[PDB]
Design a protein around this ligand. Structure first.
Ligand SMILES: CC[C@H]1OC(=O)[C@H](C)[C@@H](O[C@H]2C[C@@](C)(OC)[C@@H](O)[C@H](C)O2)[C@H](C)[C@@H](O[C@@H]2O[C@H](C)C[C@H](N(C)C)[C@H]2O)[C@](C)(O)C[C@@H](C)C(=O)[C@H](C)[C@@H](O)[C@]1(C)O
Lengths: 56, 209, 122, 114, 9, 120
RNA sequence: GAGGACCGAACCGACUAAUGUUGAAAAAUUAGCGGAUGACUUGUGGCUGGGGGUGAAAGGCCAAUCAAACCGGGAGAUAG
RNA sequence: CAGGUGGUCAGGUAGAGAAUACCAAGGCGCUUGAGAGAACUCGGGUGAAGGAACUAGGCAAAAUGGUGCCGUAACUUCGG
RNA sequence: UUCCUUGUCGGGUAAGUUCCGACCUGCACGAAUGGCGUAAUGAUGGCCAGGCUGUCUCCACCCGAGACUCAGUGAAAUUG
RNA sequence: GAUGUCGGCUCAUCACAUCCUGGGGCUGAAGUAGGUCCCAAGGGUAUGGCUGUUCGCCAUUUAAAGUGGUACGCGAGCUGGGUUUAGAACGUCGUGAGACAGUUCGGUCCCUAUCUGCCGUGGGCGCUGGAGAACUGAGGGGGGCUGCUCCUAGUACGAGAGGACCGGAGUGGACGCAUCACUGGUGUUCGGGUUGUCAUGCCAAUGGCACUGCCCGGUAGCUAAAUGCGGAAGAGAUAAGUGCUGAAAGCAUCUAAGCACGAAACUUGCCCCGAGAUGAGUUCUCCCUGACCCUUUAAGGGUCCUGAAGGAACGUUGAAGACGACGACGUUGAUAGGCCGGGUGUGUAAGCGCAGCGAUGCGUUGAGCUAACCGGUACUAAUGAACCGUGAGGCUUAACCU
């Protein structure tokens, strides 16, 4: 249940290869206000698909 | 002879005049059509490719749509191959029907088994559970021993172990057929068949005698 | 669904009262038995004037089960309790002169003809 | 779905009388006797109805010569014949599994009388 | 905790 | 293996789900809008919406059936008397889900939920 | 109204089993258990100091260590 | 830090009761959460047929459970 | 307490190296290093039976806590 | 400067000196059934009672209940009964402390997986333009058991009794796979009954808590105890064996030349995986046909204009799923929820009226309530986009463009 030997830093790095993050790159311009926002998500100003909602 | 693509609808039953209750599984079978005829020349072996159903006109890709375009006919939901009986000779685009099943007597209904997901050693290979008590601790449904000692010193390949179950191709053999309703494209094979309801099926005549 | 170490009510005037299915005849590694399958059984209890005495060992046929007997139409004939007739150990045939209770239709199998002739029901 | 229900309703018989659970109901049963197909009666109080369309069936308990005898019967099975209701009656709770333990006088059921 | 006991083989 | 199961355990015993969705259902009514986690917000739609359907037809019996749920006379009073007629001919779609980014507290998927009209 | 009497909480004790075994805990928790007017339990404060103390006796216990406590010293003891 | 720490105050209903359940006064939701609903593990519920065939062993679970009354054997130091 | 030994016989069980009773051929019982018997008592040892049950035949499903994923913090034994 | 030690549970793997099934020889082999030996490891190869026991004995099965290797397989899988600590006693030994492969009672079984290995599932890249599918099957794995009964036939055989060889048919046991239609289980998300208490001001009606309070049922789903199927037939080449012809050796001889049969073993057939099969294969289809410099002048480095097929991301999701993946849907629209209708379960709601002093009953009423089902429905949630991926695709040789 424990290592008999110490792994190389090289071996440790190959394990980290799948740990890399990927940018969503899915941001979309608002139809009205024109501010950028994530797709299928409301704008911080509350606008969504051009209609006014929330207003907070 | 060639099989035909089918589709599970739901298990039922067909009452007989003698009063015996024989279980059956309804299987609609829209008529197949031969998109292409394979041969020893151009393809190196004789075979037919067929399709059925009605895929949405928008979701069909052009590279796929251009394949059906060669056949001159609207695209099916999918594609499946069937080996020729050697003596057979089918023209391209021919509408093969369920009527062929009237004399098949027995058939092998291929289907994809239900996905049980990941499963333990007990569910997959029917291993018996160990003692539930008598001082037992942290060991019931567990596989337990999986090898000897220093000899081999390795687990054997193909060893029965916990893993993925279901969601794989299977084929029950020599299933009996009862009714062949061409008017409704029904195929009432006797007994249970592999596959989830609404899943695609591939019925073929039994190799067994 | 008879198995090993299973008590059964006596089904005939053999003089036996309580019996137990020590063994299940008919094939290797066999477990369950019922309907009409033969089972050798010990006699754990018997009335004094009966043909059989306590501790006797002889083959016997099941006649009724709590599980019931299945039918081709899907119907099943369940019974409130298990029962069995004491066949002779040497060559079948019931020992008792009267078999109590409604024997099931599945007994129709040549050798069991003597049993079904008794008990008018079924 | 619709392909299934259409196939089932066609096999369904249209001559089944309605009956409340707990009613006394004779159940005629055709059966082979090794030759002649003589019919046989089977009277008994219903204890558990299970309607499932074509798959529908109901248990019919009967206390004969000692221990009782329960027998399920498919509503649409060829083997079953007449399903006459010999006795009007009523009980709360359609299931009657508790009657299996009750015996003799305990098994009484009052008539629905309406 | 360390315990004690004896390894009598 | 689930298979055709519906609803979600949401890491809670059913006795709490009979309560946590009972109180939250009333909060959605009182302000006609509440902020909540996305997985839970979908669960809410199967709760409040049927209650609105009960309000479609006023009767002495239905007023008590509503009382068994939500357990607040102030909330049910808005039903029938107000929320009932207001949806009128509409059938379903009483509310909508609107995701609003992830919570700063632990990257929880926040999602607004609100009534179709909102007139307060 | 007698009892080293009975059932049974507090209180005291720790028989079985699971969990825990780098634990929440250097011996506990959970589900049961024994005693519970007495050879009872407990608060507070004293007494017995190391070949000695105490012990309804296990060579147990004497500050998480006891077939001879701990601290410092002889002592950098000796070690084929 | 799921342990240890003496005394005092003793509400409502049910109950023999300081047991136990629900509540008053009052104090808390226990310093990581949000999800997904695999094995396996821990803590529980139920299970058709059989009822110790399990196992070193009825281990563990299950079951029995209150008050009033009828009635109660061998044996005995005549209290059991 | 008996090595031979699973002594022999009888009882219990379909079958009993254990249990009960007896025989005495007591390797190597024995009378205050007490013999024998004994009502009651026992978280005591062994055996049998009723009831009871997933202990088992054979596991099946469900309710919660981990396991899994995301976010925050962030160890361990071991290691030419 | 530690290799955990008997048995049991679980899980196995290999050998053949073969327990059963198969193929034969010989028989002091009539038949049935045996003896013994050869070939053959494909499959199968008991439950209990006693004892810690393996073993063994007994009871009863079975076509048979093989012999062994694998650290007398298997404690980083389990059990701690045995043995094998610290308590104690009996017998025996010693003056004694103690001891006894003599006995009895009791006595903490640690470790979150680094590598190899295995069961699964992905990311990346290559397969030489890119992409979507259908594949060919090199190779590998899985499956391979068998009784009973009947026909042949009460015939061959035999004095009687008994009772077949070959072949055929039917039906079970054990095992594997698939399935929920039935028969059942579960169903803390459905309905109802009911106990104590609290709360909603109270009557009435509901809800909270007490293991889901205790239960009685019960939809989907899952599941066996439930029901469908599977072992083969055939063929190829053989082992032991049975031969044909035929010399060496005038004869004889199965073999030396040649030729014919011959087993559940072998190769196929049966089912699954599968071109990372780098020996990276085939077939079908789809998409891309712009303008100038720099450098060590070439499979060179870039800019501008272009961004296609298709993929991915996001969202709704799924009888797919640990996470990825996979299938489906995304406004030209049934993917999910809701909704309408239906089904199913619960079994006579709430309210009112009537009958009764009352608890209660009757009528309204198979009523009310219905989760996960089925059929319909765009009410809502799936936004127009943007992202990844380009601009005709090396060299050499041959065959064709009639
Ligand atoms: C709580 C945790 C403790 O573990 C246990 O209780 C288990 C259950 C013991 O086995 C107990 C119980 C038992 C029967 O072993 C199961 C016994 O044999 C040993 C002596 O003690 C262990 C592991 C023993 O090791 C064993 O040492 C043996 C001499 C050899 C054996 N090895 C060769 C395989 C090894 O496993 C031993 C001595 O305690 C380990 C030493 C280092 C310790 O004292 C350590 C500090 C222990 O306190 C502990 C590990 O933390």
């Amino acid at each position: 249940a424990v290592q008999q030997n110490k792994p190389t830093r090289s071996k440790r790095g190959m394990r980290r290869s799948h740990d890399a993050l990927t940018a969503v790159t899915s941001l979309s311009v608002d139809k009205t206000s024109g501010e950028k926002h994530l797709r299928h998500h409301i704008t911080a100003d509350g606008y969504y698909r051009g209609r006014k909602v929330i207003a907070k | 002879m060639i099989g035909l693509v089918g589709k599970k609808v739901g298990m039922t039953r067909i009452f007989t005049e003698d009063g015996v209750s024989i279980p059956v599984t309804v299987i609609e079978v829209e008529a197949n059509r031969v998109t292409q005829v394979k041969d020893l020349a151009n393809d190196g072996y004789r075979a037919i490719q067929v399709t059925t159903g009605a895929k949405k006109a928008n979701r069909v890709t052009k590279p796929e749509a251009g394949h059906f375009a060669k056949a001159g006919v609207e695209a099916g939901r999918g594609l499946w191959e069937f080996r020729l009986a050697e003596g057979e000779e089918f023209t391209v685009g021919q509408s093969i029907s369920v009527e062929l099943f009237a004399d098949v007597k027995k058939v092998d209904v291929t289907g994809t088994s239900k996905g049980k997901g990941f499963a333990g050693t007990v569910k997959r290979w029917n291993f018996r559970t160990q003692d539930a008590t008598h001082g037992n601790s942290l060991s019931h449904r567990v596989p337990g021993s999986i090898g000897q000692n220093q000899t081999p010193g390795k687990v054997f390949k193909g060893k029965k172990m916990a893993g993925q179950m279901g969601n794989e191709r299977v084929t029950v053999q020599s299933l009996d057929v009862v009714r062949v309703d061409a008017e409704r494209n029904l195929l009432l094979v006797k007994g249970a068949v592999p596959g989830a309801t609404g899943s695609d099926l591939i019925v073929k005549p039994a190799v067994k005698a | 669904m008879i198995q090993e170490q299973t008590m059964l009510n006596v089904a005939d005037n053999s003089g036996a009262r309580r019996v137990m299915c020590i063994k299940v005849l008919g094939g290797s590694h066999r477990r369950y038995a019922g309907v009409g399958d033969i089972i050798k059984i010990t006699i754990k209890e018997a009335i004094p004037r009966g043909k059989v005495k306590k501790g006797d060992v002889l083959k016997a046929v099941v006649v009724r089960t709590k599980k019931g007997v299945r039918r081709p139409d899907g119907s099943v004939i369940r019974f409130d309790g298990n029962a069995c007739v004491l066949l002779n150990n040497n060559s079948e045939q019931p020992i008792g002169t009267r078999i109590f209770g409604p024997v099931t239709r599945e007994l129709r199998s040549e050798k069991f003809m003597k049993i079904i002739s008794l008990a008018p029901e079924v | 779905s619709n392909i299934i229900k259409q196939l089932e309703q066609e096999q369904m018989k249209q001559d089944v009388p309605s009956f409340r659970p707990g009613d006394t109901v004779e159940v005629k049963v055709w059966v082979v006797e090794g030759s002649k197909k003589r019919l046989q009666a089977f009277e008994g109080v219903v204890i558990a109805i299970r309607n499932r369309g074509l798959h529908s069936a109901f248990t019919v308990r009967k206390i004969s010569n000692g221990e009782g005898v329960e027998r399920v019967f498919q509503t649409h099975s060829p083997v079953v014949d007449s399903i006459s209701v010999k006795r009007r009656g009523a009980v709360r709770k359609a299931k009657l599994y508790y009657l299996r333990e009750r015996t003799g006088k305990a098994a009484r059921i009052k008539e629905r009388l309406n | 905790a360390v315990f004690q006991m004896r390894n009598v083989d | 293996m689930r298979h055709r199961k519906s609803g979600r355990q949401l890491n809670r015993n059913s006795s709490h789900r009979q309560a946590m969705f009972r109180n939250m259902a009333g909060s959605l009514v009182r302000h006609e809008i509440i902020k909540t986690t996305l997985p839970k917000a979908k669960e809410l739609r199967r709760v409040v919406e049927p209650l609105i359907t009960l309000a479609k037809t006023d009767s002495v019996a239905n007023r008590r059936l509503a009382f068994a749920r939500t357990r607040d006379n102030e909330i049910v009073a808005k039903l029938f008397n107000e929320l009932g007629p207001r949806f009128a001919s509409r059938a379903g779609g009483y509310t909508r889900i609107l995701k609003c980014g992830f919570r700063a507290g632990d990257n929880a998927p926040m999602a607004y939920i609100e009534l179709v009209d909102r007139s307060e």
